[PDB]
Write an enzyme that holds these catalytic residues in place. Sequence first.
Site, PDB file in Angstrom:
ATOM      1  N   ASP A 184      -6.965  11.384   3.999  1.00 45.03           N
ATOM      2  CA  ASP A 184      -5.820  10.686   3.442  1.00 45.03           C
ATOM      3  C   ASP A 184      -4.844  11.728   2.913  1.00 45.03           C
ATOM      4  O   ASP A 184      -5.243  12.853   2.626  1.00 45.03           O
ATOM      5  CB  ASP A 184      -6.284   9.792   2.288  1.00 45.03           C
ATOM      6  CG  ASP A 184      -5.328   8.673   1.995  1.00 45.03           C
ATOM      7  OD1 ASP A 184      -4.104   8.872   2.130  1.00 45.03           O
ATOM      8  OD2 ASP A 184      -5.802   7.585   1.628  1.00 45.03           O
ATOM      9  N   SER A 193      -4.011   0.198   0.057  1.00 44.62           N
ATOM     10  CA  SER A 193      -3.071   1.313  -0.148  1.00 44.62           C
ATOM     11  C   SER A 193      -2.498   1.289  -1.581  1.00 44.62           C
ATOM     12  O   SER A 193      -3.257   1.311  -2.561  1.00 44.62           O
ATOM     13  CB  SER A 193      -2.003   1.387   0.957  1.00 44.62           C
ATOM     14  OG  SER A 193      -1.415   0.125   1.210  1.00 44.62           O
ATOM     15  N   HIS A 214      -6.071   7.601   5.969  1.00 43.98           N
ATOM     16  CA  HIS A 214      -5.580   6.716   4.929  1.00 43.98           C
ATOM     17  C   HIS A 214      -6.065   5.268   5.166  1.00 43.98           C
ATOM     18  O   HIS A 214      -5.833   4.697   6.229  1.00 43.98           O
ATOM     19  CB  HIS A 214      -4.053   6.826   4.836  1.00 43.98           C
ATOM     20  CG  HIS A 214      -3.424   5.725   4.050  1.00 43.98           C
ATOM     21  ND1 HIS A 214      -3.743   5.477   2.728  1.00 43.98           N
ATOM     22  CD2 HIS A 214      -2.534   4.774   4.411  1.00 43.98           C
ATOM     23  CE1 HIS A 214      -3.055   4.435   2.304  1.00 43.98           C
ATOM     24  NE2 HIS A 214      -2.314   3.991   3.305  1.00 43.98           N
ATOM     25  N   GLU A 223       4.244  -1.260   2.152  1.00 48.95           N
ATOM     26  CA  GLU A 223       4.803  -2.153   3.184  1.00 48.95           C
ATOM     27  C   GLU A 223       3.909  -3.360   3.520  1.00 48.95           C
ATOM     28  O   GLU A 223       4.406  -4.366   4.006  1.00 48.95           O
ATOM     29  CB  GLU A 223       5.127  -1.394   4.479  1.00 48.95           C
ATOM     30  CG  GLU A 223       5.085   0.124   4.385  1.00 48.95           C
ATOM     31  CD  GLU A 223       3.661   0.678   4.353  1.00 48.95           C
ATOM     32  OE1 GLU A 223       2.722  -0.079   4.701  1.00 48.95           O
ATOM     33  OE2 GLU A 223       3.480   1.865   3.979  1.00 48.95           O
TER      34      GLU A 223
END
Lengths: 360, 359
Positions: free
Chosen positions: A295, A212, A324, A143
């Site tokens: 994570d 990420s 994370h 995202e």
Amino acid sequence: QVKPEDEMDNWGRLILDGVSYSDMVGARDRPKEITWFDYWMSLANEYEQEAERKVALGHDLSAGELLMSAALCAQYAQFLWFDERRQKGQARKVELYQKAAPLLSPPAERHELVVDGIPMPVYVRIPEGPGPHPAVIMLGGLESTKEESFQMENLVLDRGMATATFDGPGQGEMFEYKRIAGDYEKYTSAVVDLLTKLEAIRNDAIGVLGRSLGGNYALKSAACEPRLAACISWGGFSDLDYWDLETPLTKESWKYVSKVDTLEEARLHVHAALETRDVLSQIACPTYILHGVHDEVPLSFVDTVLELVPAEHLNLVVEKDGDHCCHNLGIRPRLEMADWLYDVLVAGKKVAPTMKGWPL
Amino acid sequence: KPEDEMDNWGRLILDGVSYSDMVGARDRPKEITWFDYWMSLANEYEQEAERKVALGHDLSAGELLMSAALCAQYAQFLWFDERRQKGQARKVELYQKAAPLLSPPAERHELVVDGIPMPVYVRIPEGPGPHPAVIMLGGLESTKEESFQMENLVLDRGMATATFDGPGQGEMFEYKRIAGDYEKYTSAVVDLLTKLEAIRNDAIGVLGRSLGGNYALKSAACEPRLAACISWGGFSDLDYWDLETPLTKESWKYVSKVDTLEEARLHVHAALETRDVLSQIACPTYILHGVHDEVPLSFVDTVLELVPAEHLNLVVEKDGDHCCHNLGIRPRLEMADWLYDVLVAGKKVAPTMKGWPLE
Ligand code: NA
Ligand code: NA
């Protein structure tokens, strides 16, 4: 087993990215009939009328900051939203950053690239003083898109490194054009071509910073791109063996970016598309891996990268308390990232392959 | 509660205290005290910054020392036992290290006002000058080490900054409890600025935070040199004493070096009166008041009556608490830009009034 509201209210992530604490508390304490989407979208409107007033009064600096705030409110209204409105939030974020970019100091310049016959806006920022400059290509994730990396940009620009941002397959602006793909490296590569062409940038001093999923993309870009002098996987991964461990809304995002109907269809597509273990042995640049122990990405990734990334290149940092991307740990890890990108790209310090916090 | 006063989320976050750090403060093991929590963090921050200096990472070194200082500041800002002085000293020494590493650096000018040392820190914008300057005034507990965030906003906008600790504050507290002539110490700070060639002599304003706002109004009324004035969560007198939080009354007691509340009240109410002198102000004045401040809206009545009309820019924030910290960065950006208009721009701003009258 984690709740949707709580996946969205990631205090660490949103605060470090520049989302206002007070807006955060207002999101948390909002009336129950007001959705997350509407709440943040109204704020984006608010911040946009503010910045208009500032421009009118000749307050360009403030107007850049208020437009960043508006674009970040849009980003975070829609980032984990999957109905017919998602499209409008994504489009609103993009509109807002487009206005923000020329008011940011230093400014974000638009370069309208076309990869594989698909338009791909590239935003570039340039630090203080006469040319040229090292650059850090910054990679978004599931995202995270170009509009969201503002504060990380600011850290490296403060250290005399330019930045370059873009949305490739499955991401932000390109999602409408292309679903998530297995050759992201050609996107990063095209960009290096822009930077090698632009005379304001040092050609032997381009690196990549992925966040990420971008973490995965960075490792892939490096394994396939000899000209890149730095790889950072920031909360990234090597492969999708770990799929079942993903949060519910992450599984939703995987399905969303793949444009498939079922989670198993997504898993299948993403597992093949995002594999790197066949090419991790090719990365030929200083490679910094930041990994949070808590994570959803498990420690077998740390095992994989030790096993596969050339021992001479690997700078491994595992944070025992890190979630994370280690967002829950505050600015420290980000500073460390930017300082190491300095050491590699601007310092010229041939850094020793090293481990921090490993083994446990 | 004392814990809720200490945990002022808006204040601390806007000032640059790490959210991660604040969470561990709220969730600390009960046997570990607020003081010790924050003091332990400042040590950690200091260590990391030494590693950074050793590695040529000067820019991170400053930010981490700045983090150390603030952890020290917020350990001690509402503490009143014997550790209070150690907390204050830690903050002082941490910031002294931070200051040359800042971007731009905070430069030490060592003043003495009547036998009494008064360290002044000056930060200069980029490129050539001369430069307008903003003197920034701390409050009851706010000291020169605290204002880094407000500084950077004004330095971004082409204005020097100067900070110092006056009577009853910070480093001076040792030598001088809170006093009735703060205008004296401001004017000394102006003296130095008038002497330093890198600063515009007809372009020096004052920005007072909290109690600092009362000092800013006092100074402007007593100092014809001052080109600008901001009262940020300030006040004109102490009629409203009873309304102060328990910990604020304790701080009044403390800075007055008395044993009782009424002793404190008598002394500070006299020392901090401005009403006889506010009409004497001949410079642009910006007052930002938050409706839910413990400072009542009587203050707004006083200033509209007594601050002359052609100079008053009034901003009343109806959701704002003390210093409007709960409203995020926007009121602070408004102050930095207003100072920019008055001190940088060849700009005569007209007497305007926002958020008043009430609804
Ligand atoms: Na080039
Ligand atoms: Na001067």
